Amino acid sequence: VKELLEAGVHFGHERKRWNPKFARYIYAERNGIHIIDLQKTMEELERTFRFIEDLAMRGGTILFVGTKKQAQDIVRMEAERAGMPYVNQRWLGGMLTNFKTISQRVHRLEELEALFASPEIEERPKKEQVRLKHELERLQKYLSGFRLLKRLPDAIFVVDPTKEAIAVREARKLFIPVIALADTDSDPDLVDYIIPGNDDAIRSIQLILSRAVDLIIQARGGVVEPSPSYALVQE
């Protein structure tokens, strides 16, 4: 458990595409690959999961932002289990902020769903229908986990918050708690709460994330087990 899980398959990163304040977190910098300090990282994880279980047991959406394919795939399934409205595919400008507009985009999609199994299965012209198939598909292709986000979200979990500081950027201006997770690449004070840990390792993703999801399922009282994992991680 904990620190010894890391001595297994995950640790520090960076070809020196780093960030100075994160280097205060840092131990060493050999191989060219910074030597993460997973100890005080365990301290961080302590405070992190404190608020995790708190806000989760009280109830209010933490906003799975995984985007890089790897992460994304795993997290998506995990997200479905985590119960939290989630960012699956490529994060697009508008979600965080243009909230009402988003609710409208949903409405177009959801009502496409509603009127996809209607007498429209009979009627309606070909070009209209077929095109509407296409854009219905893509609409759900992006707004899957987002389709279930309807009232002031209260923290995010995210992954590597540089890209996912496109994401941070938004929720950061939005006076909102943002947990989020990365290597010595990103920035510490860029975030509200910090998980200093590599995220190009698919296993790392699996482990820390399942830890969090289980933390929120234990906020409500339980904890089962994940389906997505070691599978496509290595094969």
Partner RNA sequence: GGGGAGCCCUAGCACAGGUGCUGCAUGGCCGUCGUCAGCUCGUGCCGUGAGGUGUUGGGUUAAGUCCCGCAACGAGCGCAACCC
Residues that bind RNA (CB under 7 A): 89-90, 92-94, 97-98, 100-101, 105, 125, 127, 134-135, 138-139, 166, 169-170, 173
| Environment class of 144 (CB within 10 Å of its CB; exposed 0-12, middle 13-18, buried 19+) | middle
Residue entry with tokens 């960012």: 87
Choose between 150 and 173: whose C-beta lies nearer to RNA.
Answer: 173
| Structural contact between residues 184 and 26, judged by C-beta atoms closer than 8 angstroms | yes
Smallest distance from RNA to CB 66, Å: 14
Helices (H), the chain: 3-9, 22-25, 38-58, 69-82, 99-114, 126-142, 164-173, 202-219, 230-234
Closest CA to 89 of 75, 74, 72, 109: 72
Smallest distance from RNA to CB 90, Å: 4
Choose between 139 and 195: whose C-beta lies nearer to RNA.
Answer: 139
Choose between 55 and 174: whose C-beta lies nearer to RNA.
Answer: 174
Choose between 72 and 184: whose C-beta lies nearer to RNA.
Answer: 72
Smallest distance from RNA to CB 192, Å: 18
Choose between 3 and 137: whose C-beta lies nearer to RNA.
Answer: 137
Cα within 13 Å of Cα(63), Cβ side = 25
SS3 (DSSP) at 196: strand
Smallest distance from RNA to CB 64, Å: 18
Smallest distance from RNA to CB 162, Å: 10
